[PDB]
Amino acid sequence: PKMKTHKGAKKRVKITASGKVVAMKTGKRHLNWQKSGKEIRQKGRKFVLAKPEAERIKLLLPYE
Amino acid sequence: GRSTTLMRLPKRGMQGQVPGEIKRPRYQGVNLKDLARFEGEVTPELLVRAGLLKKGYRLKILGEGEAKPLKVVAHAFSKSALEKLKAAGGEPVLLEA
Amino acid sequence: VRIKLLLECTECKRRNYATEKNKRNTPNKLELRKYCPWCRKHTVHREVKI
Amino acid sequence: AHKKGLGSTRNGRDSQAKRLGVKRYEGQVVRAGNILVRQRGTRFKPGKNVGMGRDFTLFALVDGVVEFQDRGRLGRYVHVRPLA
RNA sequence: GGGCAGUUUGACUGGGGCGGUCGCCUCCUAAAAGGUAACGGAGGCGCCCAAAGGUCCCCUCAGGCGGGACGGAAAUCCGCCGGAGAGCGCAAGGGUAGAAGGGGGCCUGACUGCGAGGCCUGCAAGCCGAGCAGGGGCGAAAGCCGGGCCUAGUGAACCGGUGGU
RNA sequence: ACCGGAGCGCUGUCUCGGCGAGGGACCCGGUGAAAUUGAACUGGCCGUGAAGAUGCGGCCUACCCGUGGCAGGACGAAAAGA
RNA sequence: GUAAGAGGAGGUAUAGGGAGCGACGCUUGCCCGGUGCCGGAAGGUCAAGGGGAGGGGUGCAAGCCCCGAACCGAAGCCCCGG
RNA sequence: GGCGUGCCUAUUGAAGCAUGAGCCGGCGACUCACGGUCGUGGGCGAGCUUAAGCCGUUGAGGCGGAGGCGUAGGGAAACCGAG
RNA sequence: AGCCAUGGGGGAAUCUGGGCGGACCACCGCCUAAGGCUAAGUACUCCGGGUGACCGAUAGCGCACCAGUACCGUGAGGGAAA
RNA sequence: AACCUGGGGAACUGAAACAUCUCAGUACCCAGAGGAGAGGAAAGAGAAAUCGACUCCCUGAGUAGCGGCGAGCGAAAGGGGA
């Protein structure tokens, strides 16, 4: 029956409604202290593509 | 080996607690190039079973398009779209008086 | 290693941070070193917790 | 098969060779950002319209044409001159 | 609470046990970029500093001969010879005195919002960062400051904890 | 009806085996299996080959086919190696 | 056996269950440090429970609901000993 | 008389002294159900197309717009809006 | 962490009574509990007939002809051929 | 024989291990009920001063939710009809 959208990556990723899957930056959690603002403002967003074609698929049915 | 590049991190602010989703007044973004396509009047009943709309609550006139001496009917009006009413049009909010 | 314990220099004016590290093994007490928060200028910056 | 006494070591570890060298040569055009040398010490030294950040590495400031400089009594330099 | 029920019991390897090991950095093996395998070579690292950061003013080694209470192949000073073998936290490599070394005055840019563009590489991270807008230190000024001569001082994501919008 | 060691009498266990005996086999007569089975028109040396050949090669004895008998090879059958 | 009951046993500690060596004749040494077994009205921690100082939301208010201290608690492991 | 080391499988690699296989007749393995997704044949056009079902049918079709698709995305959100 | 259901323990009232609007208190709505009967459209194939871009004795149901007979094993059950 | 409501309730697998989970309250055991049953007239349903027993088909929609927030699991209102 109807394939199930993967609730997970659905609950945690973006793709601009043109087809370019663009995600969210990590390595940002339990660090911060000896680090600097450079890593801060950089640790504000992310990118990606190529295998996020397979991920663009994994989204599935409602596309999104 | 690793998780499916699951190294990504979730944010999904309010991914729904459990009692359900917020029963909220959803919308309908629209353009005045669509208002330009038809003259006369753009009420709900017309635009719903024609145009776009589809049984979906508040309409918001906006975007670029053309200014014409016609009547619209919606619920919220963008400041930009409010200015295409200036050149020619009508401004009807929330119906009931 | 500790005795050099780390801290997040919280500023007054109700928050805004910059992160550092102390030095208990040095006469360093608390530290209100002059730094610049996300909002404003080079104002104050004190010391809190770990 | 009576394999008499053997031994063991410690010399199995090897650091990872990170890519080194100069990236541009005389001619190419940098565009503010196009780094040019991943060097250790001053094997090459910056000058006109060429910078050098924290790793000893010369890079880009202008839309320049690359050139070198032999100086010996100071070493070797890498200069950039765009249009003028 | 082994009387019974249920799973776990890594990988390593000149056939297996044992030891040893899984990450990073140094330079050989690397055949003049890269780069590369071995129970092939020798090694170091999971820390550090409110000054060991910062701007400006200043001085410049090791050692070599001669000379000196204690010292005395080494204390230290002096005279001269000495262009980096000194020192540059801890491994080296490399670079360095036309400073990055050693002393001092005023501070405190281990800033905020970004981010041009490259190195690297499957990805993911890692990486150098013009220049811009706020504001601040130094210096008359030119100009410098988004940590320390550098190559390790690391841990994706959820699950939570505190302060806060 | 348990494992060593030694002496006595006795014996085909051995030296060294010979004869005979009935029954299998061998010839005729009645009937008639099996595992294995790609096909074979299937000999040997010296080398060849993923290391061990009738078959490749520089080369061997020998008319065609059979019967009794021995057991070396077909990496021999029993297994999808204890 | 979930039990009901059953066996044990219409037996009674010269009995019935377990372990250990396996006639009889001679014999049995060191240690409670561990562990288990034993024995213990001090002491420690500690489950639900009792409790209520403080405390929150809310309604004008009476109030309803939740967070919840001090102190009390055994079995157990530690503790004293055999 | 010149030339010639079976087949399949397996393998860095077979005449292999690795194996399947005596011979033959026949049976016997890449489909479909949902959805996606790229390319394709057409009706359509800022538009498309109905589902259950109902009417009819005796291999006879039409009707039924709920709904999905499409025009606005951008912030997780409130929401701002070709920004 | 709601509502339903309930095993224990504590244990109401009879319409400002009760339960719910997702912990809970305030405001506003919903509906009257702890006893009961209900056709219709649903679901299926022992079975009647009817049909098929279903098969033709290795196919087809296992069983086309006396198939749940032979025969396997005490047994549950296996399962032909023709 | 199937369909049916309750009374108990698996393991293999997926997660490339594996206990939360899943497989599924699914196979399977009991019992009973009948062409039907089961169910069933509102302490409902839920945001508007909205509808109004039950079962069925559809969309709602893999949506809303759920989870070592992994595998994966996964509904109700509304509306179109019986």
Contacts of A34 in chain C (CB under 8 A): 6, 19, 21
Contacts of C6 in chain A (CB under 8 A): 33-34
Q: What is the resolution of this structure in A?
A: 3.9
Q: Gap from D9 CA to E33 C1', in Å?
A: 32
CA pair distance D32, D59, nearest whole angstrom: 8
DSSP string, D21-64: EE---TT-B--SS---EE-SSSSSEE-TTEEE-TTS-EEESSSP
Which residues of chain B approach chain A closer than 8 Å at the C-beta?
4-12, 15
Ramachandran class of A41: left when φ > 0, alpha when ψ lies in -120 to 50, beta otherwise? alpha
Name the maximum alpha-carbon separation found in chain A. 52
CA pair distance D16, A34, nearest whole angstrom: 25
Q: Which residues, in sequence order, are bridge partners of residue B61?
A: B30, B77
**Closest residue by Cα to residue B84 from B74, B94, B70:** B70
**Closest residue by Cα to residue B54 from B63, B62, B45:** B45
Residue of A nearest to C7 (CA): A33
CA pair distance D84, B72, nearest whole angstrom: 60
- The minimum CA-CA distance between B5 and chain A, rounded to whole Å, is 10
User: Which pairs with CB-CB distance under 8 Å and at least 24 residues apart come from C37-43?
Assistant: C37/C11, C37/C13, C40/C13, C40/C16, C43/C11, C43/C12, C43/C13
CB of B26 within 7 Å of some strand H atom: no
Could you identify the residue written with the tokens 């409604």? A17
- The experimental technique used to determine this model is X-ray
Contacts of A32 in chain C (CB under 8 A): 8, 19
Identify the DSSP state of A8.
H
Contact with chain A for residue C36, Cβ under 8 A: no
Answer positive or negative: Cα dihedral of D44, D47, D50, D51: positive
Chain A residues 16-35 with a CB less than 8 Å from chain C: 32-35
CA pair distance A55, B8, nearest whole angstrom: 12
Contact with chain B for residue A11, Cβ under 8 A: yes
